[PDB]
Amino acid sequence: VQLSGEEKAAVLALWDKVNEEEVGGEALGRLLVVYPWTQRFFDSFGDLSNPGAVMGNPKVKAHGKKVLHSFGEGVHHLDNLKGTFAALSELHCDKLHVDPENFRLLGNVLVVVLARHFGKDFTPELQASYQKVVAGVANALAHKYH
Amino acid sequence: VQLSGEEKAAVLALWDKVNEEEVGGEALGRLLVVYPWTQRFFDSFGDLSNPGAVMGNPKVKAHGKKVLHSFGEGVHHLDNLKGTFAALSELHCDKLHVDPENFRLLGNVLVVVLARHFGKDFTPELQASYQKVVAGVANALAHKYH
Amino acid sequence: VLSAADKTNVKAAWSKVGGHAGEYGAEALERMFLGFPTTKTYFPHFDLSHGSAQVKAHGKKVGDALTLAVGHLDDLPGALSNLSDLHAHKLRVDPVNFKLLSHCLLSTLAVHLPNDFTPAVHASLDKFLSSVSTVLTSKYR
Amino acid sequence: VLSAADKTNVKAAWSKVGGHAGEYGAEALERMFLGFPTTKTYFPHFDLSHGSAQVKAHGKKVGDALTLAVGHLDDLPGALSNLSDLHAHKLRVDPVNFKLLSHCLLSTLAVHLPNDFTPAVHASLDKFLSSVSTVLTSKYR
Ligand code: HEM
Ligand code: HEM
Ligand code: HEM
Ligand code: HEM
Ligand SMILES: [C-]#N
Ligand SMILES: [C-]#N
Ligand SMILES: [C-]#N
Ligand SMILES: [C-]#N
């Protein structure tokens, strides 16, 4: 993505403070509650009938950590997102059959969660950089679809 | 795009029969009628208040021909769509500020028009190939946005 | 939800489809499965080959639900109440898929009724399919 | 359009926003202009710099229209009739933009009301902003 040197520094300084477990469990939990059709992909996780069951579900937290850990890898590799997410793009496309539109949704949920956790420090300028970031990951994941 | 050798031949044999003027004027005309917000981008064209004015407008036909001529260039260059639409991607992004979502819309309108013109010859198999095609052009045009 | 003008074009266009609604429903499904492969994941129990008796039988139900909707443009949420439960609650169909099937329905109509498929009718049928789609995904809202 | 449960969360959440609706409206606009630059094309007559008196004055109107909507969740098309004419007829706002401003409104609320911004409230406000957005683009349907 097209990020100056001052943006890349701000984006990276924030990730130093991101707890992948806490933020990861929350982002995935909110995607499942706010956009219910996404639950279809995670039946094996058990009960996800209400917001309480979902947010407290151990498999949801564990999986959310995995997602954010790969997100962090993209952040530290903004010059080659398509190479970092190549295998994952095939996984979600060929095997899971997730419509790429949902990658944009999870990307935006993550941003809302970062906002919730960082408050005033998540400035309009910093959010703008993170939107380019989540968009670049979303695109790298949709790559193997066309 | 990922098109076999039998698909590429079918896609190309059909374009031999496409009148860029007739199909081009119709596709652009229907985009403007069916998705009214797109009219905003073509104020200079004059009156586009109703479906009759739009379809008969000379600037709409002339412009539609231009769009389809560039579409035809993409068809004959399916191995390097991003290079063929590089300048156009900058035009629509930097200057016009067209949201990439509208590229998908025009792509689908074109398909409906091809269906209308070719009837039974526009088989479900042939349409599937054309969906990969319009999607690949849409992606090449959105390139300069991220 | 639709304008009086739109309702008139919709009922008129559907009167020309007449008794082919089932056939167009089956064809639209085929065009969707081939053009947008991800949608096939919702029909693992179906034989999805061309001429499949199942998708023909299924296209008949789809066609019949749309004829029902046209005869009830003033109260779609009510007339389609059960389909909305089936699609959003039980199957959890991704909203994006409703746009794909709508595009394939319009494509099918354009093939079969080229002279009737005018710009004005096209715009009304698009609004009609958008309305039905909203009703069927209403449990997400 | 919304469930009774959703209406309750929406009125409750907005009561916590209280008198900051104008401020959050201005902040949400700023986050939108910076994060999604294409949207700035609709405001060529505005000074879009941080602290701009114009976007502050504008954010107040946006905030006030949302407070109006919350006090009329049972009849949005009526209460927002004039805004729908302005946005779809006169300005011809691309529907995609309503999703961008909604995301920035939720982002702003999350910054300012972290404890109140629970998963359940988040889901209801999303449905609320989706409903308002549908009403404002209704002239395309
Ligand atoms: C930014 C977007 C995303 C990222 C970075 C991401 C990342 C990942 C990662 C790292 C895995 C584990 C792969 C492995 O262990 O080999 C995974 C698996 C999975 N993802 Fe995603 N994902 C994304 C979006 C989505 C979305 C939107 C959905 C569905 C709505 C989805 C559904 C799944 C499922 C069902 C699995 C398999 C889970 C299992 O182990 O049962 N992903 N994803
Ligand atoms: C598949 C998608 C598209 C293709 C292949 C395409 C192609 C073109 C081409 C060839 C030109 C002329 C460039 C030149 O003469 O240098 C052009 C200009 C333009 N395009 Fe597109 N376009 C696409 C989609 C769109 C969409 C969706 C919109 C707006 C909703 C749009 C708005 C315009 C406008 C306003 C102009 C300038 C017209 C003028 O001369 O006043 N284009 N496009
Ligand atoms: C205009 C939009 C649609 C209409 C009118 C429609 C109508 C119907 C009808 C009438 C049924 C039959 C239920 C029964 O037999 O009781 C059905 C079932 C079903 N629909 Fe839809 N549908 C629509 C869109 C979709 C989409 C976009 C998908 C997914 C891509 C989908 C997937 C299914 C599935 C999987 C079933 C159950 C099939 C079976 O097991 O027999 N539908 N739909
Ligand atoms: C929740 C969604 C929205 C709400 C509640 C809303 C509300 C309003 C209100 C209350 C006004 C003032 C009209 C007046 O002063 O009479 C307005 C004007 C306007 N809105 Fe929106 N709006 C929304 C979304 C959008 C979006 C997405 C765009 C474009 C990105 C947009 C662009 C405009 C413009 C250009 C004006 C006229 C500004 C001026 O010239 O003073 N609005 N809107
Ligand atoms: C993937 N979560
Ligand atoms: C561009 N039309
Ligand atoms: C449902 N087809
Ligand atoms: C409108 N802002």
Numbering used by the authors:
A (entry chain B), B (entry chain B): 1 to 146
C (entry chain A), D (entry chain A): 1 to 141
Lines quoted from the article behind this entry:
Hemoglobin (Hb) is one of the best-characterized macromolecules and is regarded as an ideal model for studies of protein evolution, cooperativity and allostery. In vertebrates, two heterodimers (α1β1:α2β2) comprise the oxygen-transporting functional tetramer contained at high concentration (∼5 mM tetramer, normal mean corpuscular hemoglobin per mean corpuscular volume) inside the red blood cells (RBCs). The release and uptake of protons by hemoglobin is known as the ‘Bohr effect’ and ionizable residues influenced by this effect are known as ‘Bohr groups’. In most models, Hb is proposed to exist in two states: a high O2 affinity R state and a low O2 affinity T state.
EqCNmetHb is a stable model for the liganded hemoglobin R state crystallized at physiological pH. Equine hemoglobin has 88% sequence identity to human hemoglobin and is considered to be isomorphous with human oxyhemoglobin, with most histidine positions conserved. The EqCNmetHb neutron structure was solved to 2.0 Å resolution using joint X-ray/neutron refinement, a resolution sufficient to accurately locate D atoms in macromolecules. The C2 symmetry of the EqCNmetHb crystals aligns the molecular dyad with a crystallographic axis, reducing the asymmetric unit to an αβ dimer and the number of His residues to analyze to ten for the α chain [residues 20(B1), 45(CD3), 50(CD8), 58(E7 distal), 72(EF1), 87(F8 proximal), 89(FG1), 103(G10), 112(G19) and 122(H5)] and nine for the β chain [residues 63(E7 distal), 69(E13), 76(E20), 77(EF1), 92(F8 proximal), 97(FG4 switch), 117(G19), 143(H21) and 146(HC3)]. Two conserved His residues [αHis20(B1) and βHis117(G19)] were determined to be doubly protonated (His+), with the occupancies of both D atoms refining to a value of 1. The H+/D+ occupancies of these two residues are clearly influenced by neighboring conserved acidic groups: αHis20(B1) is hydrogen-bonded to αGlu23(B4) and βHis117(G19) is hydrogen-bonded to βGlu26(B8). Interestingly, two His residues that are unique to equine Hb, βHis69(E13) and βHis76(E20) (Gly and Ala in human Hb, respectively), are the only others that appear to be doubly protonated in the R state and are also influenced by neighboring groups: βHis69(E13) is hydrogen-bonded to βGlu20(B2) (Val in human) and to βGlu73(E16) (Asp in human), and βHis76(E20) is buried in a crystal contact. All other His residues in the EqCNmetHb neutron structure were determined to be singly H+/D+-occupied (His0). In the EqCNmetHb R state, the Nδ1 atom of αHis103(G10) acts as a hydrogen-bond acceptor to a water which is bridged by another water to the side-chain N atom of βAsn108(G10).
